[PDB]
Amino acid sequence: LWSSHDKMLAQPLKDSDVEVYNIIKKESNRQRVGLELIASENFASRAVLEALGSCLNNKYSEGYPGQRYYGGTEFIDELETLCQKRALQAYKLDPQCWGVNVQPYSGSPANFAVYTALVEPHGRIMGLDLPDGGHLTHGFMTDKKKISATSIFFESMPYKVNPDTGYINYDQLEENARLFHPKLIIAGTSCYSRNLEYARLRKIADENGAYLMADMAHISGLVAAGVVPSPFEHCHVVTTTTHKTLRGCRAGMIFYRKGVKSVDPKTGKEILYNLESLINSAVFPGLQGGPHNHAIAGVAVALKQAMTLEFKVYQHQVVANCRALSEALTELGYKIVTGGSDNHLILVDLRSKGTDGGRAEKVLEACSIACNKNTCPGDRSALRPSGLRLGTPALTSRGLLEKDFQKVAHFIHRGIELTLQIQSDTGVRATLKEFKERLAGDKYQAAVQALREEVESFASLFPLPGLPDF
Amino acid sequence: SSHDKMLAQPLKDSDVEVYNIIKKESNRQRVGLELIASENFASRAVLEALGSCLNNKYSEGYPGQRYYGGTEFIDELETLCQKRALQAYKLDPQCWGVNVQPYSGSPANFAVYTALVEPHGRIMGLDLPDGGHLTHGFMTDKKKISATSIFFESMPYKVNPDTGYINYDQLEENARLFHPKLIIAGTSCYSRNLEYARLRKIADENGAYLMADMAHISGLVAAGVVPSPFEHCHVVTTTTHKTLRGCRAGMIFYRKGVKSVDPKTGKEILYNLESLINSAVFPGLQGGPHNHAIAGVAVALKQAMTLEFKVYQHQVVANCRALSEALTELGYKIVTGGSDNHLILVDLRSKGTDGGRAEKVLEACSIACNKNTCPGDRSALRPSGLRLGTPALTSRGLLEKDFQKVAHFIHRGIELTLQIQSDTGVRATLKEFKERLAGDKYQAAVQALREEVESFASLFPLPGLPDF
Amino acid sequence: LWSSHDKMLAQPLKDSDVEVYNIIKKESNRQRVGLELIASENFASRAVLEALGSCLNNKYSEGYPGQRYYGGTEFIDELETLCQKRALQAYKLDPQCWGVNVQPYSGSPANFAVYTALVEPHGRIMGLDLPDGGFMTDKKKISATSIFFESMPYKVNPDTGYINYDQLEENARLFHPKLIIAGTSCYSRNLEYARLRKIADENGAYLMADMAHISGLVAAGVVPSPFEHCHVVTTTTHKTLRGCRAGMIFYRKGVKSVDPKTGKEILYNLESLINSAVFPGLQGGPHNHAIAGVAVALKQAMTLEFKVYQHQVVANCRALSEALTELGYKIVTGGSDNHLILVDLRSKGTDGGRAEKVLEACSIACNKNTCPGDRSALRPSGLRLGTPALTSRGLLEKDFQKVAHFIHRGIELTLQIQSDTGVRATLKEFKERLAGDKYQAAVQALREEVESFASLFPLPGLPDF
Amino acid sequence: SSHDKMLAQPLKDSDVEVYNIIKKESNRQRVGLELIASENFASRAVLEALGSCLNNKYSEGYPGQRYYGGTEFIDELETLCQKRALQAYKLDPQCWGVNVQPYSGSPANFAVYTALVEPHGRIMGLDLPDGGHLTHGFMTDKKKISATSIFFESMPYKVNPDTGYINYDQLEENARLFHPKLIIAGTSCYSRNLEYARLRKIADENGAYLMADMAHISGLVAAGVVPSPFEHCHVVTTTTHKTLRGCRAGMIFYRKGVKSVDPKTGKEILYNLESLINSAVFPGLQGGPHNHAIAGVAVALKQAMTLEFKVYQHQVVANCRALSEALTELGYKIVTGGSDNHLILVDLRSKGTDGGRAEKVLEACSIACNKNTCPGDRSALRPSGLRLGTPALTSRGLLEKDFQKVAHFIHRGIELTLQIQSDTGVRATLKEFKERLAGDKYQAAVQALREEVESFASLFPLPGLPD
Numbered sequence A: 001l002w003s004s005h006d007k008m009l010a011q012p013l014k015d016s017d018v019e020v021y022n023i024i025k026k027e028s029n030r031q032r033v034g035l036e037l038i039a040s041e042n043f044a045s046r047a048v049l050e051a052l053g054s055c056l057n058n059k060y061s062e063g064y065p066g067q068r069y070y071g072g073t074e075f076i077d078e079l080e081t082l083c084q085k086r087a088l089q090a091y092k093l094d095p096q097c098w099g100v101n102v103q104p105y106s107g108s109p110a111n112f113a114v115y116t117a118l119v120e121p122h123g124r125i126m127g128l129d130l131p132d133g134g135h136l137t138h139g140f141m142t143d144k145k146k147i148s149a150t151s152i153f154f155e156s157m158p159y160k161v162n163p164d165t166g167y168i169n170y171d172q173l174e175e176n177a178r179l180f181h182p183k184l185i186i187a188g189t190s191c192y193s194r195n196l197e198y199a200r201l202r203k204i205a206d207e208n209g210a211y212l213m214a215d216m217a218h219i220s221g222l223v224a225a226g227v228v229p230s231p232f233e234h235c236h237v238v239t240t241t242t243h244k245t246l247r248g249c250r251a252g253m254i255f256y257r258k259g260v261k262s263v264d265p266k267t268g269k270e271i272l273y274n275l276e277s278l279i280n281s282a283v284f285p286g287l288q289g290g291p292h293n294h295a296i297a298g299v300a301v302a303l304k305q306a307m308t309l310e311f312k313v314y315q316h317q318v319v320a321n322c323r324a325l326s327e328a329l330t331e332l333g334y335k336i337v338t339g340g341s342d343n344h345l346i347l348v349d350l351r352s353k354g355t356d357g358g359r360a361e362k363v364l365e366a367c368s369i370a371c372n373k374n375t376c377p378g379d380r381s382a383l384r385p386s387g388l389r390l391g392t393p394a395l396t397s398r399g400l401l402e403k404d405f406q407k408v409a410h411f412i413h414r415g416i417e418l419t420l421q422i423q424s425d426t427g428v429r430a431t432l433k434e435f436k437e438r439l440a441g442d443k444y445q446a447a448v449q450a451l452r453e454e455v456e457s458f459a460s461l462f463p464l465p466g467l468p469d470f
Numbered sequence B: 001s002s003h004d005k006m007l008a009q010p011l012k013d014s015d016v017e018v019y020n021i022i023k024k025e026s027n028r029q030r031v032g033l034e035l036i037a038s039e040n041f042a043s044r045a046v047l048e049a050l051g052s053c054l055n056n057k058y059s060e061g062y063p064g065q066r067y068y069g070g071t072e073f074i075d076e077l078e079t080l081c082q083k084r085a086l087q088a089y090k091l092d093p094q095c096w097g098v099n100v101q102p103y104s105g106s107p108a109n110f111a112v113y114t115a116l117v118e119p120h121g122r123i124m125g126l127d128l129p130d131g132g133h134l135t136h137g138f139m140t141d142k143k144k145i146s147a148t149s150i151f152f153e154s155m156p157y158k159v160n161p162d163t164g165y166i167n168y169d170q171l172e173e174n175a176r177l178f179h180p181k182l183i184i185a186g187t188s189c190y191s192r193n194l195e196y197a198r199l200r201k202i203a204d205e206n207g208a209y210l211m212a213d214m215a216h217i218s219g220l221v222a223a224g225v226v227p228s229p230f231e232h233c234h235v236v237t238t239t240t241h242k243t244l245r246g247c248r249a250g251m252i253f254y255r256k257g258v259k260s261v262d263p264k265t266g267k268e269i270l271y272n273l274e275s276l277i278n279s280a281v282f283p284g285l286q287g288g289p290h291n292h293a294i295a296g297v298a299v300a301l302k303q304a305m306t307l308e309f310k311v312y313q314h315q316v317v318a319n320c321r322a323l324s325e326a327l328t329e330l331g332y333k334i335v336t337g338g339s340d341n342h343l344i345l346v347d348l349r350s351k352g353t354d355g356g357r358a359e360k361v362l363e364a365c366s367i368a369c370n371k372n373t374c375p376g377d378r379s380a381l382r383p384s385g386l387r388l389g390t391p392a393l394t395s396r397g398l399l400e401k402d403f404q405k406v407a408h409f410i411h412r413g414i415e416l417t418l419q420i421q422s423d424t425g426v427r428a429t430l431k432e433f434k435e436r437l438a439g440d441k442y443q444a445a446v447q448a449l450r451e452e453v454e455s456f457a458s459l460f461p462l463p464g465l466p467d468f
Numbered sequence C: 001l002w003s004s005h006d007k008m009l010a011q012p013l014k015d016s017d018v019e020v021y022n023i024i025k026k027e028s029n030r031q032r033v034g035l036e037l038i039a040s041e042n043f044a045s046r047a048v049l050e051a052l053g054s055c056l057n058n059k060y061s062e063g064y065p066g067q068r069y070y071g072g073t074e075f076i077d078e079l080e081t082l083c084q085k086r087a088l089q090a091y092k093l094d095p096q097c098w099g100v101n102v103q104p105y106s107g108s109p110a111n112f113a114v115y116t117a118l119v120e121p122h123g124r125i126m127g128l129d130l131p132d133g134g135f136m137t138d139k140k141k142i143s144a145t146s147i148f149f150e151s152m153p154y155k156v157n158p159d160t161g162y163i164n165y166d167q168l169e170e171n172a173r174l175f176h177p178k179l180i181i182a183g184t185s186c187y188s189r190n191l192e193y194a195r196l197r198k199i200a201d202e203n204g205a206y207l208m209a210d211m212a213h214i215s216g217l218v219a220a221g222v223v224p225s226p227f228e229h230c231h232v233v234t235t236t237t238h239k240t241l242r243g244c245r246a247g248m249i250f251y252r253k254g255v256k257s258v259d260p261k262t263g264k265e266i267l268y269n270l271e272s273l274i275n276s277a278v279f280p281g282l283q284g285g286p287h288n289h290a291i292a293g294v295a296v297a298l299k300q301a302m303t304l305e306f307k308v309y310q311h312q313v314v315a316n317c318r319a320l321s322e323a324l325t326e327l328g329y330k331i332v333t334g335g336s337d338n339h340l341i342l343v344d345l346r347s348k349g350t351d352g353g354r355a356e357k358v359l360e361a362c363s364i365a366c367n368k369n370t371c372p373g374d375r376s377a378l379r380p381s382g383l384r385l386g387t388p389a390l391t392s393r394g395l396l397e398k399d400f401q402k403v404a405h406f407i408h409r410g411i412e413l414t415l416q417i418q419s420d421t422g423v424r425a426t427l428k429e430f431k432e433r434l435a436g437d438k439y440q441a442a443v444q445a446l447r448e449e450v451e452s453f454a455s456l457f458p459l460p461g462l463p464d465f
Numbered sequence D: 001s002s003h004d005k006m007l008a009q010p011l012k013d014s015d016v017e018v019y020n021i022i023k024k025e026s027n028r029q030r031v032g033l034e035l036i037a038s039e040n041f042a043s044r045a046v047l048e049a050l051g052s053c054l055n056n057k058y059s060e061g062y063p064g065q066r067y068y069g070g071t072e073f074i075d076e077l078e079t080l081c082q083k084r085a086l087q088a089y090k091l092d093p094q095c096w097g098v099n100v101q102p103y104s105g106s107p108a109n110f111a112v113y114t115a116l117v118e119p120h121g122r123i124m125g126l127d128l129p130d131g132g133h134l135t136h137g138f139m140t141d142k143k144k145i146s147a148t149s150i151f152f153e154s155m156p157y158k159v160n161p162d163t164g165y166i167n168y169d170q171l172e173e174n175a176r177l178f179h180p181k182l183i184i185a186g187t188s189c190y191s192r193n194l195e196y197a198r199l200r201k202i203a204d205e206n207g208a209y210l211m212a213d214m215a216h217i218s219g220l221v222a223a224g225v226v227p228s229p230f231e232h233c234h235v236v237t238t239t240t241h242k243t244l245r246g247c248r249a250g251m252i253f254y255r256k257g258v259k260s261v262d263p264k265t266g267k268e269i270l271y272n273l274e275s276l277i278n279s280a281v282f283p284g285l286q287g288g289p290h291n292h293a294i295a296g297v298a299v300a301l302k303q304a305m306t307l308e309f310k311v312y313q314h315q316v317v318a319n320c321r322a323l324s325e326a327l328t329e330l331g332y333k334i335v336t337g338g339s340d341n342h343l344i345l346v347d348l349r350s351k352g353t354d355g356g357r358a359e360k361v362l363e364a365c366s367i368a369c370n371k372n373t374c375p376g377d378r379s380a381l382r383p384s385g386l387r388l389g390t391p392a393l394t395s396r397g398l399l400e401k402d403f404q405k406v407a408h409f410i411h412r413g414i415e416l417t418l419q420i421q422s423d424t425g426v427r428a429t430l431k432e433f434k435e436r437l438a439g440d441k442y443q444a445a446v447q448a449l450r451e452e453v454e455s456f457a458s459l460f461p462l463p464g465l466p467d
Ligand SMILES: *Cc1c(COP(=O)(O)O)cnc(C)c1O
Pocket: A040, A106, A107, A108, A135, A188, A189, A190, A215, A217, A218, A241, A243, A250, B286, B287, B288
């Protein structure tokens, strides 16, 4: 009846479902007294959380503003226009010579859409390899079979970097591009701790009449603050994610050039760009249908908050804390790839000690500390990584400082010593299973318990931003 | 304390533009009239579970082989969601697999395609102009539009124009020549149902797989009023925002176990679709799964197991039948005789007007609706069918008398449409009709109708946020 | 030392190598005293034989006339132009609205070139199936045409034996093909090119015809000419024209259609596409000897001799069919207007193969069939005979009657052999015991019998060889 | 009796224009000079076996699975040709298989590609403007020309311009990033030699196959002067019209035997390329085989087994060395400082004359030659190299004593083209060049040169059917 219907769709989750409520409570309690060092995570603001749970979920609309398939979408069109304006003004771009689109759901759909729109199906692709700081959506083909969709539906030839210097090689890149004849140059970055020469990439792309593509998903806030040079001056298409350093919901953005490309030497006809129409026809209904209106408000609020001086101060503090942490780690006796790191994520190398990344990451996880393992440029033993990638994208937002980061570095050093002790006790010839079994030792259990208790007591002082009342 | 104030600033103090936009949208949705089958309201539990700390967690991978560390809570939540989804449709636990990683229907369909189709092979589905979804396949002569036609070779069949029933002998005789590899069973606008037994028999005779799409009738299958397609099907795709009243996500149901026995050696052939379906989603097409969407889907699915959901579905179908008979009593006939589902395809061929004019005039008087190509239509750029449904109306608390009053309102609206049609002209074009739709008397009439429907619907509450 | 080798270098083949010489002599003696009924073979005159062994086998001139890559190729260009003119005039085709290409080496290369020129990689092609007078199954893939391009064949009505245009219309409207193939190898009835042209114009696709079996019939004027409706027509010059193994491609030229909106006229682009796909697409240097042979063959076929030969072929075919029906033998569909005939023996006890083997063992070459309906994996169920093969020697009505009598005697002997071994016998057991003495001497007589019938007529070809 | 005079009629009585054309071609080839490295005259036995009753026989299938009956005589010739091909290059019978069904090199290569590399695969071959064949792979950013680049993906590698040798150091590094399925070891001229050891090593390390195209040096491989690549490559394709003094045909050599052993299971892995090539050849891109071509290649391989073939090859190498030293003595420079095979590539960049102008001038003075791109050029539009050879001259009877005279004639022609270029202009077009070729100031020179070369070439005989 009417009374039973009210208590069904208008009842809080605290008493309706106690399983999901307890799960969320436990997750919040774990993330409140735990230190996170993942270079691809960050806490969102309360405004984004409130905008995500708005009433926009009960609105299924299709089409772009002006040619909507359904009716009564005036507010949706206004919100989309406001979001596009905020996205175009956040990076200080010209609306007449640039375009933005927030229709894709995440980074993968946006990349697949831009591909299907400009990759020329059954063509050739050229991007950075995966082990030398590259993404999976940038081509991953093996000798036996392919895994990534881009490698299954298209042909891609990745290039490696110098294992000694550590920088991306550019001399052989031009020859490989001239001998391969590609149609799109990808410069994705996943673990690279240095910058890239966009001028040479644009020159190589123009030499063969191809296009240049670069994704700023890993470096999104620094580009808006002014710490990292903006790549909107040499690339044709730019994609990014708003769930890394932008402090927003999971969404995708696509930037393209709109205007004249070249001039005709015969008479002088201006060749207009043919990327906006292709991207629009491929993102919808070429790949997906009805977009997510609940994330538009969140991404708009995030883009608006990123324009304030607080965002710039936060980015400056992030880079300062990153430099301090790198210097502290190098002072203890650890080797860092390329010396330092201009970005926030660093690539720590542990090959000098002889311990792989698997056991180190497992122990660091056991001591209530997050981290991600990766391979080093020129690693012979591909089965056991020797790199422990770190990042501080969310620690600064809680209140971490120089002394706090120094204490965290000391804790990491203690964990490394514990890993070395466990490895020497179990032997080097042993496999990973032996290390996992030896980790449960009485002495090792007491040591990891004391370490986790100390790190929890030290991290419990900093607050946890999020949604109150629970 | 600027950093702490910015990260905790309310929505009303951070940005007022988005707040005012959300308020206006909520008000318009509260006082209005919705008759679209795709539109449906959501509960408050899913809205509260969507926006939480789950967005801060980012860990990609299947339970048991996670790439990151310390994700036992996410694994437990995923296992609970899978168990709930398996126990909802009363499926076999050790013979069916559920996947919730896809973001929506399109990514799930693309994953299933890249997993069990072998690109550039054979594909047979339903035609788009004859009523269907664009993801099922759309290939023309000018240029390809849908990804199914760009990455695969689609070969859809036609439907009967007079009887309106799905033909079978044509596809039966064409499958022996085209040699399809995967059969599609999904329609976006169809009054009748589909015979899954014949489709399964054809798939077994030709040696291929079969997939179904019951998104529109999702809720209808959760109650038990529509024959479950899991009896003679292999792959099933279904969203959670058409009838289930949940967040935007997808559900992929697949069969696991033994397929056939050897004729001589008698060796069982174990299924191998699990590995392919898993590799297609991650790390094949998607990366980090959305934990908030999974939690919302789990809540919306668990809240539909009680008798309340069954009573709601029964009342929905009863009210839909009552509304259909009430509208037909005035003379507006329904194509294909009747409709056993919660959607109706109204046709106004005898009136003379098409579907575009009716949709525009209805949208002008705050009446949600949508057009669609009816069986036997020649004007493809301007169809003549109107898709109507009442899934959200019954969810608000509307009764029989209220629906009768709504029917009277729709009758007055149709009278206004006939008036503007006779005043504009029988030979008027599109632009002329759109510019002449606005009239003094017509403006006053639509204003009075809007005020009346708003005052009548204001007494009914709105689920989700409390008066927000 | 070098002087002694120069003498043997220019020595005849009879003194250089005796093995191949004896092999050629034995093959000639066997084909002279033996008679065949194959429809895919025909004796060639000495003109093409002398032209193939000319000095043109050493010249290497790549490219088309006017765009050659080497120098001193005026004679090659003149010969190619003469061959093109002869081919264009052999079918009364206007040179301003029709083309010709003799670069391909056979029918398969020309067909593949036309396919890659009109159908882009991984395109849609519509053609006739292999069993119903003609290829891709649901298990494996053999034909390269189906490997590089997805093809959807259409079925025909098995009751009346005609192409189902009603179903073909909807099939082409739903599948939306690009190139419709109009060719067959066993279909005795004719084809309606008007319906195919209308379907191609409605769906916006192209039409391709294959007249390799009637290459000569269209030249004489017996069967209708498919050039009035088809766009691209390809054929060979080694089945009916009595020439060498080669191929010819004919394409349309001029204005395709007029657009009232723009006001201009669209011109054909078949010439450029074919020129770019043939060379250097999949072929290198053209065989000048083959061009000279086909040129002299087309020149000799321009006189009334070819027409009277085709008329005599039709008359001999009708006489043979009448003689076969008189002896008590059923003919499938009662013959047709072409030269090939399908003799049915299902009512005698053996559908096919069993009698064909014994016939081949008695100096009587025949061919099987692929008509629908087979108990085993693949049964012929029909004997295909070719009249243009034996008429090239100078046979007449009485000659065909004697051949029919010999065939009847052979069929009776085969029936007796199969009845002596039984019906439950397999193929290997039947082929092993096929050398039974009880009939050996018998067939022996029949053998010399046909021999006495072959030595009386002269065998065409090159003298002294 | 009309059929008697119709079929049994000589070519001279039936046709006249074709007879006159053949006579003119024979007369031009008799008093004309031949220098193309891809042209040669076959023996009289090949021409005699080409035209016979074999052209009237048709049978589709392979020996043992013939679809038509009465083919017992064809199986004998087939096995005889197979045995001759297996014993020509001294190959093991139970270890290698031969195939002579393809018509030419292009269909054979296409069948090998379709049988080894899956459609839309990845292959690596020599680039066309760097000494590679067109059938190996060629494509640009605008469109495609070759069929290999259309139906498959090919990645060509350039050649080192300073050293003049193939940049093998880049192939090993590019194979790990491109992951090819078949390595194409072919070339157009390549005056130098190759090393199949490292190529086979890289091929087995990358898990791919090796297809060597030795059609240009086939005869050399049959003489032992060039290392045979059979003991190092998997598939070997060749022809019989470029060399061996035979007709236009093809020949494929595939490996059949034990590839490798597996210690885990304990069985032995056997080769399977035989079935693949048999299925790709028929029914593949061709239909019925040509018996005349099979008989011609068989008689050619049989005639090449005597000492005459070795003597001819030695004389060809000696003639090539004499021509190279004579051309270098005049003042011309040769690529890589000499040559190893019979063919040579002369460079004229130091002179200042394009390859097209020199080629046209030589062709106008009754001298055969063909231009080609020189290693180090910016493009292939205006080549600067000229490919020369002496197979026909050696087969006719030319000795080393006449090479000095032909070199002097070539030098005179070069001086004439230099004067013409200096008279026409700095950037004169082809129209003005061809117009000035017959100018009053140059008509006497070209006329005297043509008369001299004609009188010098009309002395040696020409092998072939007399009259
Ligand atoms: C971290 C990252 C992502 C994250 O994956 P999503 O599923 O898109 O959230 C995507 N793209 C790039 C380049 C990344 O670095």
